[PDB]
Amino acid sequence: QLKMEANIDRIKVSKAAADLMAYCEAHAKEDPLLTPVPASENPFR
Amino acid sequence: DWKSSLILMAYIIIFLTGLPANLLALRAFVGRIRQPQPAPVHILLLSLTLADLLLLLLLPFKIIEAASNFRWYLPKVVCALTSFGFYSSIYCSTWLLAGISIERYLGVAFPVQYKLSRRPLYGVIAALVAWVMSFGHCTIVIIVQYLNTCYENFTDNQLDVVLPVRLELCLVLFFIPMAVTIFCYWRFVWIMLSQPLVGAQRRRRAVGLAVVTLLNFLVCFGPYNVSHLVGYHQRKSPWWRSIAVVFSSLNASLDPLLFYFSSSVV
Amino acid sequence: QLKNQIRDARKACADATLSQITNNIDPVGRIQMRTRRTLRGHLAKIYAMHWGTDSRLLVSASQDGKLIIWDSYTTNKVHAIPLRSSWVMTCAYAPSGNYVACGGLDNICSIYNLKTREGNVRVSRELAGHTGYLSCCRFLDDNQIVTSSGDTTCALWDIETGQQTTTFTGHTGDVMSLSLAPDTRLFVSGACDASAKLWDVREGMCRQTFTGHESDINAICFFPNGNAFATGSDDATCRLFDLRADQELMTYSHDNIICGITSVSFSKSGRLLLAGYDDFNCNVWDALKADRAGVLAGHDNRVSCLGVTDDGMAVATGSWDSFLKIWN
Amino acid sequence: TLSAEDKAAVERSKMIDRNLREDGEKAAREVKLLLLGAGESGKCTIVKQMKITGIVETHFTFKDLHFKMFDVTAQRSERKKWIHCFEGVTAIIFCVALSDYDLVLNRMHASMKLFDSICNNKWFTDTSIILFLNKKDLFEEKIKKSPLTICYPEYAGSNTYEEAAAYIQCQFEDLNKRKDTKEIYTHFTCSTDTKNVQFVFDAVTDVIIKNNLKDCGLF
Numbered sequence: 082q083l084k085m086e087a088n089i090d091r092i093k094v095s096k097a098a099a100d101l102m103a104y105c106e107a108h109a110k111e112d113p114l115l116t117p118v119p120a121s122e123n124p125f126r
Numbered sequence: 127d128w129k130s131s132l133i134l135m136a137y138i139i140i141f142l143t144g145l146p147a148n149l150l151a152l153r154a155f156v157g158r159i160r161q162p163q164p165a166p167v168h169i170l171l172l173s174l175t176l177a178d179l180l181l182l183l184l185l186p187f188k189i190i191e192a193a194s195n196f197r198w199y200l201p202k203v204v205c206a207l208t209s210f211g212f213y214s215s216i217y218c219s220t221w222l223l224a225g226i227s228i229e230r231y232l233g234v235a236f237p238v239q240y241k242l243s244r245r246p247l248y249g250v251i252a253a254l255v256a257w258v259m260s261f262g263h264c265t266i267v268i269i270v271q272y273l274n275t276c277y278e279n280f281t282d283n284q285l286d287v288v289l290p291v292r293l294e295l296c297l298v299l300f301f302i303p304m305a306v307t308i309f310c311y312w313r314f315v316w317i318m319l320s321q322p323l324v325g326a327q328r329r330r331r332a333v334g335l336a337v338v339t340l341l342n343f344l345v346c347f348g349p350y351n352v353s354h355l356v357g358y359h360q361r362k363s364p365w366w367r368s369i370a371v372v373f374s375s376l377n378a379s380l381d382p383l384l385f386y387f388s389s390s391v392v
Numbered sequence: 393q394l395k396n397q398i399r400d401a402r403k404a405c406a407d408a409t410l411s412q413i414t415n416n417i418d419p420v421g422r423i424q425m426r427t428r429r430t431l432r433g434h435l436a437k438i439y440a441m442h443w444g445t446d447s448r449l450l451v452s453a454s455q456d457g458k459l460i461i462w463d464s465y466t467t468n469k470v471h472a473i474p475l476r477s478s479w480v481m482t483c484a485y486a487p488s489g490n491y492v493a494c495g496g497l498d499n500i501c502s503i504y505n506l507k508t509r510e511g512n513v514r515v516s517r518e519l520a521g522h523t524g525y526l527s528c529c530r531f532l533d534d535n536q537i538v539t540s541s542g543d544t545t546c547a548l549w550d551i552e553t554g555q556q557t558t559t560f561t562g563h564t565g566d567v568m569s570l571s572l573a574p575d576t577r578l579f580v581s582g583a584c585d586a587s588a589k590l591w592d593v594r595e596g597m598c599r600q601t602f603t604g605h606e607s608d609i610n611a612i613c614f615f616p617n618g619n620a621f622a623t624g625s626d627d628a629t630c631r632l633f634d635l636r637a638d639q640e641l642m643t644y645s646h647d648n649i650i651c652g653i654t655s656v657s658f659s660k661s662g663r664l665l666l667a668g669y670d671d672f673n674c675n676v677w678d679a680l681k682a683d684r685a686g687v688l689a690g691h692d693n694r695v696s697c698l699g700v701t702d703d704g705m706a707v708a709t710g711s712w713d714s715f716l717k718i719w720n
Numbered sequence: 721t722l723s724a725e726d727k728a729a730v731e732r733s734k735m736i737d738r739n740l741r742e743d744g745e746k747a748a749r750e751v752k753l754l755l756l757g758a759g760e761s762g763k764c765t766i767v768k769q770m771k772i773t774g775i776v777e778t779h780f781t782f783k784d785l786h787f788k789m790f791d792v793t794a795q796r797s798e799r800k801k802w803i804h805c806f807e808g809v810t811a812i813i814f815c816v817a818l819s820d821y822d823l824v825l826n827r828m829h830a831s832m833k834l835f836d837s838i839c840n841n842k843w844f845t846d847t848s849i850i851l852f853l854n855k856k857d858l859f860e861e862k863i864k865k866s867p868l869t870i871c872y873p874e875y876a877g878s879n880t881y882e883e884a885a886a887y888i889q890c891q892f893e894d895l896n897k898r899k900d901t902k903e904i905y906t907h908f909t910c911s912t913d914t915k916n917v918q919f920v921f922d923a924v925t926d927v928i929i930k931n932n933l934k935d936c937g938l939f
C-alpha cells in the first residue's frame with residue numbers, strides 16, 4: 082500500500098487552492114444559501 | 127382588630143409565593159402534555175395547577191375587602207361572583223387531590239396492569255367529573271344572594287336555606303373524596319412498606335411523601351368542611367369561617383412545590 | 393521507510409497556507425436560517441437521512457420500527473415502510489428514486505423497491521456477508537451498491553446477483569462513513585483509526601490515505617468539484633483534505649466547541665460547510681476562511697444527521713429527538 | 721388540498737400518521753431488555769432457554785407482559801460506537817460466571833472492567849442493571865480444590881459459601897457511582913427454570929413502579 086501511495090502525482094498546494102477558489106467563485110452566484118433567496122418562487126417559502 | 131391584622135400578612139405570605147410556583151409549573155405541565163404519550167397524571171396535575179391559579183387570581187378581591195377591618199366596599203353581585211369562584215376552585219382542587227390519590231395507589235398496587243392499559247381518556251373523564259361537581263353543585267351562591275353584605279348577617283330564610291345544603295356540600299363533595307383519599311393512601315403506604323425488591327431510601331421517601339400529603343389533605347380542607355356541621359349543630363353561621371378559608375388556601379400555594387420540588391430541584 | 397519519503401514530499405509540496413491565499417477575498421457575512429418546515433411523524437430517535445435527486449422527497453430512519461419518506465414541499469408523508477430490525481443507523485436514496493436502502497446493527501442493509509406495479513412497497517433485496525454493524529451504505533448506482541461496516545472493511549455489491557462484487561480492506565479502525573464523488577468513480581472512507589482512505593470501485597484497491605485527526609472520524613463529505621473533501625471527528629475539529637495534495641488544507645476548530653462531529657455536508661458551490669454537533673447545534677463554517685457564518689440551534693438533544701438538497705435550496709437536519717427541520 | 725391529487729395525498733398522509741400512532745401505542749406496553757456478558761458469558765445460555773448475525777432478538781411473554789431481549793454476541797467492534805442505540809431500555813441483564821475466577825483467559829477481573837463501563841456509561845445513568853451470578857454449581861467444586869485468594873488478593877475471610885458468594889457480590893454491587901439513580905438487582909440463577917423468570921419479572925416490576933412513581937412526583 083505504501084509503495085503505490087508514495088508514487089503519486091502531487092501538485093502544488095497553491096495551484097489546488099487557486100482551483101478551489103475559482104470553483105467557489107464561479108458557482109457563488111448559483112448558491113441559494115449564500116445569496117438571500119427571494120420569498121417568491123421559493124418552493125419552501 | 128387582631129383578626130384582620132393577622133389576615134393581612136397571612137394573605138400576603140400566601141400571595142407572594144403562590145404565583146411563581148404555579149407559573150413555573152404550568153410551562154412544564156403543558157410541555158409534558160404536548161409531549162407524546164401523556165399519562166393521566168399530567169391531566170390531573172394540569173387541572174390542579176389551573177385550579178390553584180384561579181384561586182390565586184381571586185386573592186386580591188378578598189384581600190382588599192378584608193383589609194379595611196372586615197368592611198364590604200364592593201358590589202354584592204361581584205362579591206358573590208368571587209365567593210362562588212373561590213369555593214368552586216377549592217372544591218375542584220380537593221376533588222382533583224382525591225383523584226390523584228387513587229391514581230397513585232393503582233400505579234403501585236398493580237403496576238403491570240397500569241402500564242399496559244393507560245390512556246389519556248381516563249384522565250379527562252375523571253378530571254371533567256371534578257369540574258362538573260364543582261361548577262354544577264356550587265349554585266347556592268347565586269340563589270342565596272338573589273333570594274328575596276357578603277355571606278354575613280343572614281336572615282331567617284337565608285339561614286334556613288344554607289344550613290340544609292351545607293350538609294350535602296360537606297357530604298357528597300368532601301366526605302366521599304376524603305374517605306377515598308385516606309383509604310388509597312393507607313393502602314399505598316401498606317403496599318410500599320412490604321415490597322419484594324425496593325430501595326430503602328426510595329421506600330422511605332415515598333412513605334414520607336404519602337404521609338405529608340395525607341396530613342396536608344386532612345388539615346387544610348378539614349376545618350372548613352367541619353364548620354358546616356358545626357354551624358348546623360349551632361343553628362347559626364360560625365364566626366370561625368375566615369380562618370378556615372385561610373387554612374384551605376394553604377394548598378393552593380403549597381401544591382406546586384409539593385408535586386414539583388420533591389427532590390427534583392435542590 | 394516510505395513514510396519518511398511521503399512526509400518529505402508532502403512538506404515540500406506545501407509552500408503557502410490556505411489562509412494566506414484566501415485572505416484577499418471578503419469574508420462571508422452572517423447568515424440566518426429559519427425552520428420553514430418541521431416533521432413530527434417520527435416517534436423515536438432518528439439516525440440517518442438522505443435527499444432525492446429531485447430535491448423534494450427525503451428519507452429518514454429511526455428506531456420506532458419503520459423508515460419514512462417525506463415530501464418536503466407539502467410536509468405530507470408518502471411512504472412508511474416497517475423494518476425487520478428496529479436498530480437502523482443508515483438510510484439511502486437511489487439516484488433514480490426507485491429503490492431505498494437501509495441498515496443498522498445487523499450486518500445487513502436491505503433495499504426496498506419504492507415503485508411497484510401493485511402500488512405497495514416491498515422488500516427487493518437483502519445483502520448479507522458483513523461481519524460488523526453497518527455504518528453507512530450508499531447507492532452508487534441502480535445496479536451497484538456500496539456498504540460500510542464495522543469490520544474495518546468496505547464492500548461493493550451487485551443488486552441483481554446479490555453478492556460482494558468487490559471488497560476493500562486496509563482500514564485499522566471501524567469504518568464510520570463514506571461519500572461518493574460526483575463522477576461515480578472515486579470515494580472516501582473514514583475509519584476509527586484517525587485515518588481516511590480513497591478507493592476507486594473500478595480497480596478495487598486503495599489510492600491514497602490521509603491522517604491528522606486525533607479522534608475517530610465519524611463524518612465524511614466530498615467537495616462539489618470532486619478534488620477535495622472534508623472530515624469530522626470526535627475531537628471537535630473539521631479537516632479539509634485535497635486529493636491532488638494528499639495533505640490537510642484547513643482545520644475548523646473553536647475553543648467553545650468541545651463536543652464531537654455528528655454529520656458534515658457541503659453546500660452547492662462548496663463555500664459553506666455545515667457541521668453537526670452533540671450540543672444540538674449546527675455550524676455553517678466558511679470553507680475558505682474557517683469562519684462561523686451561522687449557528688442553528690433549533691434542535692433539542694443533538695443533531696443526528698444533516699443534508700443539503702441537490703440544487704442547494706434548503707438544508708434538512710434531523711436530531712436525536714423525533715424532530716426533522718428544514719432551513720432555508 | 722382542493723385538487724383531487726392533493727386530496728389523495730393528504731388522505732394517504734393522515735392514513736400514514738394513523739398507522740404510525742397505532743404502531744407506536746403498543747411500543748410503550750412493550751418491555752425491552754439488553755443482554756451483556758464478558759467472553760463466554762456474552763452468550764446468555766441461561767436466559768435463552770426459556771422455551772416460551774449481530775443483534776439476537778428473543779421474544780417471550782410473562783404475566784401478560786411482552787419481553788423482548790436484545791443480545792450482542794457477534795458485535796466485536798467498539799461498544800462506544802453503537803451503545804447509544806440502546807438508550808431507554810427497561811433493564812440490562814449482565815451475566816458473569818462465578819467459576820471464571822480461577823482459570824486465566826483472570827477473566828473475572830475483565831468482567832468487572834466491562835461491568836464498570838456499562839454501569840458508569842453516560843447513556844445508562846438511569847436504566848437499572850440486573851446481575852446474574854450463574855454457574856453456582858461449579859463454584860462449589862472450584863472453591864474446595866482452589867481458594868478465592870488467587871483472584872482476590874485482598875480476601876480476608878474463609879472459604880464458606882455464604883461469605884465467598886457475598887464477597888464477590890459486594891464488589892460487583894459497589895461499582896456504580898450513581899447509587900441514588902441506579903439500582904443493581906443481584907441474583908443467583910437456581911436450577912429450577914421458574915425461579916429465573918420470576919426475578920426478571922420482579923426486577924422489571926420495580927422498574928415499572930419507579931417509572932409510574934416518577935410521573936406522580938414521588939421520585
Ligand SMILES: CC(C)CCC[C@@H](C)[C@H]1CC[C@H]2[C@@H]3CC=C4C[C@@H](O)CC[C@]4(C)[C@H]3CC[C@]12C
Pocket residue numbers: 166170225226228229232233236239240243244245248249252
Ligand atoms: C382518577 C383517575 C385519573 C383514575 C386513573 C385510573 C386509570 C389510569 C386507569 C388506566 C389503567 C387502569 C387499570 C387496568 C387493569 C386493572 C386490574 C384490575 O384488577 C384492577 C384495576 C386495574 C389496575 C385498572 C385501574 C385503573 C386504571 C389504572
Ligand SMILES: CC(C)CCC[C@@H](C)[C@H]1CC[C@H]2[C@@H]3CC=C4C[C@@H](O)CC[C@]4(C)[C@H]3CC[C@]12C
Pocket residue numbers: 221224225228243248251252253255256
Ligand atoms: C370520582 C372521580 C374523582 C374519578 C372518576 C374515575 C374513578 C371513579 C376511577 C375509579 C375506578 C376506575 C376504573 C378501574 C378499572 C378500569 C379498567 C381499565 O381497563 C380502564 C380504566 C378503568 C375503567 C378505571 C377508570 C376510572 C375509574 C372509573
Ligand SMILES: CC(C)CCC[C@@H](C)[C@H]1CC[C@H]2[C@@H]3CC=C4C[C@@H](O)CC[C@]4(C)[C@H]3CC[C@]12C
Pocket residue numbers: 329330331333334335337338
Ligand atoms: C416532614 C414531617 C412533617 C413528616 C415526617 C413523617 C415521615 C417523613 C417520617 C415519620 C415516620 C418515618 C418512617 C418510621 C419507620 C420506617 C421503617 C424503615 O424500615 C424505613 C423508614 C420508615 C418507613 C420511616 C420513613 C419516614 C418517615 C415516614
Ligand SMILES: CC(C)CCC[C@@H](C)[C@H]1CC[C@H]2[C@@H]3CC=C4C[C@@H](O)CC[C@]4(C)[C@H]3CC[C@]12C
Pocket residue numbers: 344345346348349352356366
Ligand atoms: C385538622 C382536622 C383533622 C381536625 C379538625 C378539628 C378542629 C381544627 C376544628 C373541629 C372543632 C373546631 C372548634 C368547635 C367549636 C368552637 C367555638 C367557637 O367559638 C370558635 C371555634 C371553635 C373553637 C372550633 C375551632 C376549630 C376546631 C377546633
Ligand SMILES: CC(C)CCC[C@@H](C)[C@H]1CC[C@H]2[C@@H]3CC=C4C[C@@H](O)CC[C@]4(C)[C@H]3CC[C@]12C
Pocket residue numbers: 132136139369372373
Ligand atoms: C404556615 C403559616 C403561613 C400559617 C398561617 C396561619 C396562622 C398564622 C394563623 C391562621 C389561623 C390562626 C389562629 C385562629 C384562631 C385563634 C384563637 C385565638 O384565641 C388566638 C390565635 C389563634 C390560635 C390563630 C393563631 C394564628 C393562626 C394559626
